[PDB]
Design a protein around this ligand. Sequence first.
Ligand SMILES: C/C=C(/C)C(=O)O[C@H]1C(C)=C2[C@H]([C@@H]1OC(=O)CCCCCCC)[C@@](C)(OC(C)=O)C[C@H](OC(=O)CCC)[C@@]1(O)[C@H]2OC(=O)[C@@]1(C)O
Ligand SMILES: Nc1ncnc2c1ncn2[C@@H]1O[C@H](COP(=O)(O)OP(=O)(O)OP(=O)(O)O)[C@H]2OC3(O[C@H]21)C([N+](=O)[O-])=CC(=[N+]([O-])O)C=C3[N+](=O)[O-]
Ligand code: NA
Length: 994
Amino acid sequence: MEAAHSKSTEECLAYFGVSETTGLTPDQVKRHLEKYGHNELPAEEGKSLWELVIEQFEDLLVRILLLAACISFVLAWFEEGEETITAFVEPFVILLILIANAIVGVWQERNAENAIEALKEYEPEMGKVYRADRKSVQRIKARDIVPGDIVEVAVGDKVPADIRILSIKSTTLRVDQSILTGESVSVIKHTEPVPDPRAVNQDKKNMLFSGTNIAAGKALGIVATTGVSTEIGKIRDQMAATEQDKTPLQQKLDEFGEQLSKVISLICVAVWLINIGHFNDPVHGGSWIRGAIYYFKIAVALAVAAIPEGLPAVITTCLALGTRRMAKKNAIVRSLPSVETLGCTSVICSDKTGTLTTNQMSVCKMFIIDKVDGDFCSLNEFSITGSTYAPEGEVLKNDKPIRSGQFDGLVELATICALCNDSSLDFNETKGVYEKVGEATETALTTLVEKMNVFNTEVRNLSKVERANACNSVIRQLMKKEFTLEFSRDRKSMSVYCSPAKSSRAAVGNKMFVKGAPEGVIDRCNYVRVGTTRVPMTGPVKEKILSVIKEWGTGRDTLRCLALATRDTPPKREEMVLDDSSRFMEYETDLTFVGVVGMLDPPRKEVMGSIQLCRDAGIRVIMITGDNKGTAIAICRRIGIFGENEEVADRAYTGREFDDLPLAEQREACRRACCFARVEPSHKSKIVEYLQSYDEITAMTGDGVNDAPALKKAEIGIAMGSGTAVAKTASEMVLADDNFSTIVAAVEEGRAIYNNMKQFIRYLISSNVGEVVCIFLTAALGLPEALIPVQLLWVNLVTDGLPATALGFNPPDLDIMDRPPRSPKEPLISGWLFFRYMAIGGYVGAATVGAAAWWFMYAEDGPGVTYHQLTHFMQCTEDHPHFEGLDCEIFEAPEPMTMALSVLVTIEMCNALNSLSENQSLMRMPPWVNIWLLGSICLSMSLHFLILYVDPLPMIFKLKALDLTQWLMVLKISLPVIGLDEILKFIARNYLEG
Ligand SMILES: C/C=C(/C)C(=O)O[C@H]1C(C)=C2[C@H]([C@@H]1OC(=O)CCCCCCC)[C@@](C)(OC(C)=O)C[C@H](OC(=O)CCC)[C@@]1(O)[C@H]2OC(=O)[C@@]1(C)O
Ligand SMILES: Nc1ncnc2c1ncn2[C@@H]1O[C@H](COP(=O)(O)OP(=O)(O)OP(=O)(O)O)[C@H]2OC3(O[C@H]21)C([N+](=O)[O-])=CC(=[N+]([O-])O)C=C3[N+](=O)[O-]
Ligand code: NA
């Protein structure tokens, strides 16, 4: 029964065919269990370990490498030689990487927590029902509760289902439902129907929501909904239905993988097409088996040359480091891939209170009526010093301090403030500062009366914790609080009914003290207090009051105004129905206006500067707040969201206004809007959708379970450090200090991380372009393998991995927060840069192939076969060039491969330096700008020498230490890559203007 709140208790009992005093029968339980299922959120996705291991082999590139491993394993199993210890190295290395890659992926899932599973925190093991088969209450498992059950709840209990309250067995029922409504204080509940079928949860005063806590009292109720049908269950279903897109980098990486495999196959086809002259070779003679091994051998090297095998690790290492850096600036990143998305943020939607503002509410202005004489009117207007919940401060008139007790109108002002109040003030002994106990609005009133001190009580004699409630206590002893009529959003006021403490069984003396939004309160005032006297409320007086309120609430003061009033002659105590909140407005009529208080929740000292940074970065900021629209707009102006004088009619909306717009107008509103006042949880989600249909990258704040759908849907969900665990698990980022400025500082940091990522991605991939050319060249010219997979793997994992990681520490550009948000669709490599890395790739390929071939021919140590071709033959069954003696295994010597590798390694150290800046010359941006990079290059070279000298390694990698002369040739062919890129950088700067 989803519309339970609007049904009478009788109607709820009759719908389920159940009696309040007996509860459901065994047959009813069985039938209701079949119909509605168990009272629980559905179980998590059954993701087994085996299924998880398989998923690690789904990526296109890892499939290629597994196929590479399989061919490599077959070529080791059917090879020529006796060394099994060296033959099975290549396949085993590739397999280890696949296994290591699988271990990490599997590990990441075991430590991952999901938000849907964090909801189960809010479903208790047990509940209490009355069922027909037993007289006394029976505690059962919450999952066995069905709609229709008569349920009992008491103080401390966690509500087991969405329940319609039937009867409250205590004076009052109080409920902590902050997790669902963001209501600070525990809320009061009643049993009367709530007419609106579309009432938001806050107006459902006759409902208990699954997962909330009873703060005070004991109630009997009937279960309306269970399982996915509850308020928390609906939140769950929304989250489960939210699919999150891959980040722009992940999408480009996948695009790259698709293209890479397409290119790998086409090269294989080219290598086959370039060797179709083998069809003209005689069938008798020649080695088919060795020529087939040669083709597969280069297919493996091709596959290994093409994949940036060390790229995922570099990305992760870079992400982890920047993440720990962001943590020190209070930005706790939960999703490593989100750092990129964060840099792309184009819209930040931010809650106001605690994030834009300090949530330290303070009264700094108030007024009472001074005089009423026909058309003429005057006010006694005061100011109050002090921005803390601390009683430290004084009341001023015209900037000079006055005694508050000197004005009778202020005495009642304080009385109303002290009594019409569900909050208190306490000094936290450990923290060293004063902390609010309840609603911020109310605690600010508590602080006000301590500053006022209307009866001049000695406060200097007491300590911090003791004087915190000194002036309040004086007023409480003066009037007895009979009851309280709780605040309601419809009438926008609250009141207390008070009787004199001095009197006994009297007939007269009672007062209602009333507080609320000025509008409704003032309209229900028939009288105006002037000192101790009373005059009728008249037009000129009303104008004057509203005029000041309008100025305080909509002008530069940006104050929340509250009107204080008294019912001098309240209805007889027995004539009041305390269970029917719909009668509460009627009880608060024929009031006497006493005064207005205006309170400021000040902006964080850093937000105004941070909003400016957003403007400079082309990031739109949207404020979301519970202030009324006029005050919301005033605050946006104050902090820089709106200009002081600019028109904003179509750029600020309340929930009501926004709902009255048709779908098309709602979308349009979202593209220009910067202020949303009084929206519901549902609006956050709709705002994100609309922003996403303009392709905005949206950051959205949230703190409660009700925020989880929107947090999950936004590209960057941002949770408060002080908020719920559920909100945190639904988010990409957590604000440790809750500060809006932390968001902006995280966006900047994200922009800087991405820029460095782009450099090392381009660096690693460009090397793969060069390695592929080398392999293609050797396969095209029929040369012996200049580079083998084991060597290629070492270079991509270790040798280049360090300079790649070092590039992650490139200094950031000074204009970082002065450019518009990066386009999600921006390619990493295109246009001139594509040509640049083709030219470098073409150079690297030729430089490595040339270095190996040079050793074979023009070198001193080599078997000088100058202009003789290895292209000619690798057969050794003809002996044309060698005319006497047998020697052919030099075609498989370790020296020319060492030449090729040392060239690759050296060029790549040079190309890392080329990668410090995209377009700037090493003459304008020198290598020593990144000390880490210089360090990594040294470490990489010493690791290259390590695999050349340290006994086991030289054999494994098929290498042997180069001569001093041979190292000079390496430098001769490698170093000019700097020159080449320098030239290409010169062309990009001068002949390609924007
Ligand atoms: C890396 C190794 C190889 C063998 C492959 O060719 O890379 C291509 C490739 C997959 C792309 C291309 C490569 O194209 C070429 O190398 C030119 C074709 C000549 C083939 C040589 C035959 C002997 C990148 C590498 O070209 C250059 C010169 O840098 C740029 C870029 O890559 C990126 O933008 C980085 C993606 C994270 C991609 O065109 C990319 O595909 C698209 O999805 C992009 C948009 O991604
Ligand atoms: N949709 C709405 N319709 C009508 N009024 C709304 C609405 N939403 C909020 N208000 C009023 O505005 C004040 C601020 O809203 P609130 O939601 O608590 O703050 P936030 O928006 O910052 O919440 P957040 O921190 O983001 O989770 C509340 O103070 C009070 O009644 C509330 C309040 N209260 O919530 O309990 C008590 C009170 N008295 O009487 O002291 C005065 C308020 N007031 O004057 O605004
Ligand atoms: Na999200």
